[PDB]
């Protein structure tokens, strides 16, 4: 049952959610070197509300790829106008997957890259979020369908450690179809390392 190459990225069914995000016109991708990620549990349309943490990723002059529940209103027409005007290099997806497992892959993506979770679920609050709390990648890509993160920064050892969580899990799970939901997570997080 050998894989026979090795990770390309950790990769999930979500595209841009604008094509004004592309950045490679000829493959109509949008290819992001070395960004912060940001990774929240809401849908964020509030300008007000996502603004501290643009302005604080403009400064550092790093692309932004944002994965919440969804990126509407005006907080992504402001992301729009920043990017057509080369102002920042920023990109925003929906996160994968429903209900309890979103929540669960979300995790998955903050270990892989280092970042944490803006869950308002516990109080956090993406207004006050700062670039501690961001992930980072060597690059992604982006294009109308998927989302491909490679090479995430977490440390190995948490990035293992939630691996053994998942295989645990699996061990528990009482049907075929929600081991194989798991062992997905599991060959997404085998994907970004």
């Given at each position: 049952?050998?894989?026979?190459?090795?990770?390309?990225?950790?990769?999930?069914?979500?595209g841009?959610?604008?094509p004004?995000?592309?950045?490679?016109?000829?493959?109509?991708?949008?290819?992001?070197?070395s960004?912060f990620?940001?990774?929240?549990?809401?849908?964020?349309?509030?300008?007000?509300?996502m603004?501290?943490?643009?302005?604080?990723?403009?400064?550092?002059?790093?692309?932004?790829?944002?994965?919440?529940?969804?990126?509407?209103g005006?907080?992504?027409?402001?992301?729009v106008?920043?990017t057509?005007?080369?102002?920042?290099?920023?990109?925003?997806?929906?996160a994968?997957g429903?209900?309890?497992?979103?929540?669960?892959?979300?995790?998955?993506?903050?270990?892989?890259?280092?970042?944490?979770?803006?869950?308002?679920?516990?109080?956090?609050?993406?207004?006050k979020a700062?670039?501690?709390?961001?992930?980072?990648?060597?690059?992604?890509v982006?294009?109308?369908?998927?989302?491909?993160?490679?090479?995430?920064?977490?440390?190995?050892?948490?990035?293992q450690?939630?691996?053994a969580?998942?295989?645990?899990?699996?061990?528990e799970?009482?049907?075929?179809?929600?081991?194989?939901?798991?062992?997905?997570?599991?060959?997404?997080?085998?994907?970004?390392?």
């Open positions: 049952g050998l894989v026979p190459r090795g990770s390309e990225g950790m990769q999930f069914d979500r841009y959610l604008s004004y995000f592309i950045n490679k016109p000829e493959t109509g991708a949008v290819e992001l070197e960004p990620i940001l990774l929240a549990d809401k849908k964020i349309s509030n300008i007000r509300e603004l501290p943490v643009l302005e604080a990723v403009a400064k550092a002059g790093k692309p932004l790829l944002i994965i919440a529940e969804d990126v509407e005006e907080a992504l027409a402001t992301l106008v920043n057509m005007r080369g102002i920042v290099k920023v990109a925003a997806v929906k994968p429903f209900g309890d497992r979103r929540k669960a892959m979300l995790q998955d993506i903050a270990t892989l890259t280092g970042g944490t979770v803006i869950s308002e679920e516990i109080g956090m609050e993406l207004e700062t670039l501690e709390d961001l992930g980072q990648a060597k690059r992604v982006i294009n109308k369908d998927t989302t491909t993160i490679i090479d995430g920064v977490g440390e190995e050892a948490a990035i450690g939630r691996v969580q998942i295989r645990q899990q699996i061990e799970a009482t049907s075929d179809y929600d081991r194989e939901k798991l062992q997905e997570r599991v060959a997404k997080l085998a994907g970004g390392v």
